[PDB]
């Protein structure tokens, strides 16, 4: 991308018929860390005491 900073901007051009032929995907996809870090029924806000 002739460079913004940490932004790689790519035009993936597949020359073949099957999508599997395309090169690797460069998108950043959504991160939901809280399904692993906060996997609890009741949210615990940072400023509260956790138990009770």
Partner 1 sequence: GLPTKPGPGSYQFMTTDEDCSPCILPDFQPTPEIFIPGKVNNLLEIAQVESILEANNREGVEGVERYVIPVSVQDALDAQIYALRLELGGSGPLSSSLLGTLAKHYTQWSGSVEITCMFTGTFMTTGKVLLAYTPPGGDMPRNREEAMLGTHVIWDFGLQSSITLVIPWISASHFRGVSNDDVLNYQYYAAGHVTIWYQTNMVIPPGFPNTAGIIMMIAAQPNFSFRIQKDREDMTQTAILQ
Partner 2 sequence: GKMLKDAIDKQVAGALVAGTTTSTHSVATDSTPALQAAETGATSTARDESMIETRTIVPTHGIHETSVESFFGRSSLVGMPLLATGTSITHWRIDFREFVQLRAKMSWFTYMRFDVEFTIIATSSTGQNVTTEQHTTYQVMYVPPGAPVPSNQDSFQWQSGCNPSVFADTDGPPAQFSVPFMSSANAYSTVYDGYARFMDTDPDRYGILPSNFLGFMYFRTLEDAAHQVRFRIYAKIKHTSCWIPRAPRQAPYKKRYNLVFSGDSDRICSNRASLTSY
Ligand X SMILES: CCCCCCCCCCCCCC(=O)O
Instruction: For residue 44, state whether it binds ligand X (rule: CB under 6 A).
Output: no
Q: Is 35 in the site for partner 2 (CB under 8 A)?
A: no
Which residues, at least 6 apart from 22, have a Cβ–Cβ distance to it below 8 Å? 12, 14, 16
The correct pick among 4, 6, 7, 13 for binding ligand X (CB under 6 A) is 13
| Separation between Cα atoms, residue 9 and residue 16, nearest integer Å | 22
- Is there a contact between 30 and 19 (Cβ–Cβ < 8 Å)? no
Q: Does 19 bind ligand X (CB under 6 A)?
A: yes
Residues at the interface with partner 1 (CB under 8 A): 5-6, 8, 10, 12-18, 20-24, 26, 28-33, 35-37, 49-52
């Amino acid at each position: 991308g002739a460079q913004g900073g940490s932004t790689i901007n790519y035009n993936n051009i597949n020359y073949y018929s099957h999508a599997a032929s395309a090169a690797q995907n460069k998108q950043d996809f959504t991160q939901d860390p809280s399904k692993f870090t906060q996997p609890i029924a009741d949210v615990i806000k940072e400023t509260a005491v956790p138990l009770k």
